[PDB]
């Protein structure tokens, strides 16, 4: 057991840890950040994303 107490100094106090693993993979992606899409155009020179 850790036995955590209010009187403990920093380093003996409890910390909550969350680890987010990411996969930047060649596979189809499902979790995208909050961006909006634009119309698709063809046969033009564009900056695409």
């Amino acid at each position, epitope marked *: 057991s850790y036995s955590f*107490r*209010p*009187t*403990y100094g*920093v380093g003996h106090q409890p910390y909550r840890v969350v680890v987010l693993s990411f996969e930047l993979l060649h596979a189809p992606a499902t979790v995208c950040g909050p961006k909006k899409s634009t119309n698709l155009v063809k046969n033009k020179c564009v900056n695409f994303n």
Partner: antibody
Amino acid sequence: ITLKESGPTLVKPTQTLTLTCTFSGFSVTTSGVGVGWIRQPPGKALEYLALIYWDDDKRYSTSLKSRLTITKDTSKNQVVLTMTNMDPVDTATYYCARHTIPSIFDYWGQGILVTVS
Amino acid sequence: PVLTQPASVSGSPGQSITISCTATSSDVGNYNYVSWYQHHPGKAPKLMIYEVSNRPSGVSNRFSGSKSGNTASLTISGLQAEDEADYYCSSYTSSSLLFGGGTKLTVLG
């Protein structure tokens, strides 16, 4: 966020004192929140008695550990503290208060005066 | 393992009053969770300061505090005639929590 107290005000020597605290406006089943008891005998400072946490963890003052028992019923928002072998010297006002870490006790009730005789 | 306080403090309204509370043990550890209460006779104790220097809601900005070493201080600025109460300090120790002896404030006039 209120806490009310009820129970005996007069107890005979060597008998057992039972006090019930009923609270409303909050739950005691949430993390970081518990309910504890404090007493104040005349002319003296506040004395810690007992504390029960949301997970039914029960802690007591080291000098009264053998005399106090604290239990709770989360369906009625009630906490009950029993103190055995009441001494004639155990005359004090008892208080029910909400327990948290960053602030030890708050939302103190008005308290109940108990005299042993 | 006892919190030590002065028996009483006093001064005129409008003046600054300091109420001290000092630990007498190392059991307090970080001593970073000091609470102060204002107790009026016939009424439930009210929390004025917590975590050394923070205020609860419903508390006048005249009340503030700080720590130095293992000693905490409660400062009452702009002293009012309504501030006559028994002030208590509280903190954690290794197996329990403690309350201070209590300091009686008197307002002069």
